[PDB]
Amino acid sequence: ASGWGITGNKGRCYDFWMDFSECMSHCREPKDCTLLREDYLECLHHSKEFQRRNRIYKEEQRKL
């Protein structure tokens, strides 16, 4: 969220964080920017892609 990367290029989840911060800078309520906030948080640790892939694996395995 700070910008500095491990390999010295750029933060992996820095573009999403900066987009969320910029949009929330000029938004009165915080419930209009929860669309981007969830996106940034998911980009941090993949809270939905992993669920999707795990559900794919489970529904494939349940074919027995």
Partner: protein, 488 residues
């Protein structure tokens, strides 16, 4: 490239003055020409001068300390609240240093490193109040904690000091470990450490739609660490022992300056800890427990410094009442109570160091003090009544407006417990007045007069305490400005 340093400008001076004092006191305390002079009063006076000079440097540049704020943004952000907290912390440190001068001569404790370590702890506290991050806060906490561990066991051949120093060390390291675990486990779940970027991704969403276990648990761990630092029940495992064993000038400084900085840290954390379901109730419960335990534990205490330690714990509970409200008036009551408690603690420890000349240990030693030294007797009685919250004195205004803030949030259970604990504490406060105005024991103990430093500080504090409810407007206005500056 040099004008950017006007923001951190006073801290540079205090660091450089500490280095100069260390160099002077190590060069001239070993020379055979001056046959190893004590060199403790000299370093103490020079350190008091340095603290006053950096206080002037900080106060005069009020419109300063804000330029190049973008450059310093990642490191520390000092708004109006930070300025007013630092200008008071420096005053308290200067008062303590001026207090602990006769202790360097009559006790014959000539170790100049004491003042140098006090100065370094003061710089750590200054770095702590403006620490607008999860890293600078921990670094400054450790910086003050190391100096405190070292100076708690400063007297080596004694037995209570070293044991208390070891226990303080263990408790502080354990607290720091918990706090650092909390900081790490909220960094890994949010990706951010700076307070601007931490009060933006969780302020609008705390448990409303869903919750994350990591961030809540880390917030709880941070709160546990902070409560350990301020010695709030039940996180007070060894604090009275630390107050007993530590040298009296140390515990005079150990119960005033650190609490101000830690409470500034808690206030700065509260601007992002917007959960309301993880921070307010824990501090509410801890405040109730601290008041109850302090009131029922200082009743049985027969020593003097143990009673002061438990009274400080009870006052910390009353202080936490005002933070539990979580409103502007709550924070205002918080700051007013902190200021009043700091002044009153300076008063009480000025008394204790005054009576330290003849090694006062128990509450009964100061018996029949109304005849030998009537003026000191009435001063100490006024201090005890100010602790009791007796109306016509300072120390009642703080508890008054604290209770008013508590009723502002509708926490009626807090008010009743506060009343009961106030009555109980008033009883054992006036118990001291009984021991030294009414009861006349067969054996009398005579106390030698004090020095001009303690006497002048005592007179100023005693006139402040009694005559405060006639002109309290400046404190109320400055505390409201400080509380209102916390958020905007």
């Amino acid at each position: 490239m040099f004008n950017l340093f006007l923001a951190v400008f006073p801290e540079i001076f205090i660091i450089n003055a500490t280095f100069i004092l260390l160099i002077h006191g190590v060069v001239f305390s070993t020379s055979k020409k001056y046959d190893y002079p004590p060199l403790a009063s000299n370093v103490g006076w020079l350190g008091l001068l340095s603290v006053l000079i950096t206080l002037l440097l900080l106060a005069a540049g009020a419109p300063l300390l804000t330029i190049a704020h973008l450059f310093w943004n990642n490191l520390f952000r000092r708004d109006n609240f930070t300025y007013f907290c630092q200008i008071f912390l420096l005053l308290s440190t200067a008062g303590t240093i001026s207090m602990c001068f006769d202790f360097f001569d009559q006790e014959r404790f000539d170790a100049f490193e004491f003042i140098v370590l006090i100065l370094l702890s003061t710089c750590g506290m200054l770095f702590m109040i403006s620490a607008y991050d999860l890293i600078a806060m921990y670094l400054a906490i450790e910086l003050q904690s190391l100096c405190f561990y070292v100076i708690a066991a400063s007297k080596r051949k004694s037995e209570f000091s070293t044991e208390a120093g070891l226990k303080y060390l263990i408790l502080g390291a354990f607290s720091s470990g918990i706090l650092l675990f909390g900081c790490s486990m909220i960094y890994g779940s949010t990706g951010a450490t700076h307070f601007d970027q931490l009060a933006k991704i969780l302020t609008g969403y705390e448990i409303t739609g869903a919750r994350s276990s990591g961030i809540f648990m880390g917030i709880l761990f941070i709160a546990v660490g902070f409560l350990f630092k301020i010695t709030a029940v039940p996180f007070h495992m060894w604090a009275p022992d630390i107050y007993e064993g530590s040298p009296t000038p140390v515990t005079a400084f150990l119960s005033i300056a650190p609490k101000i900085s830690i409470f500034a840290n808690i206030l700065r954390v509260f601007i992002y800890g917007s959960y309301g379901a993880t921070l307010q109730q824990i501090f509410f419960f801890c405040s109730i427990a601290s008041m109850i335990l302090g009131a029922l534990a200082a009743m049985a205490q027969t020593k003097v410094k143990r009673l002061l330690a438990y009274s400080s714990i009870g006052h910390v509970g009353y202080i936490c009442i005002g933070f539990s409200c979580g409103t502007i008036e709550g924070i205002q009551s918080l700051l007013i109570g902190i200021f009043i408690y700091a002044l009153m603690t300076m008063d009480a420890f000025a008394i204790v160091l005054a009576l330290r000349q003849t090694r006062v240990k128990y509450i009964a030693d100061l018996g029949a003090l109304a005849k030998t030294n009537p003026i000191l007797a009435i001063t100490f009685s006024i201090t005890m009544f100010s602790y009791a919250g007796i109306p016509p004195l300072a120390g009642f205004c703080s508890k008054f407006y604290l209770f008013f803030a508590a009723l502002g949030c509708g926490a009626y259970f807090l008010a009743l417990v506060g009343v009961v604990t106030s009555v109980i504490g008033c009883f054992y406060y006036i118990r001291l007045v009984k021991r030294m105005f009414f009861d006349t024991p067969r054996t009398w103990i005579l106390y030698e007069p004090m020095d001009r430093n303690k006497s002048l500080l005592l007179a100023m504090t005693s006139f402040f305490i009694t005559l405060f409810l006639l002109y309290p407007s400046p404190l109320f206005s400055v505390t409201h400005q400080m509380a209102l500056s916390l958020y905007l």
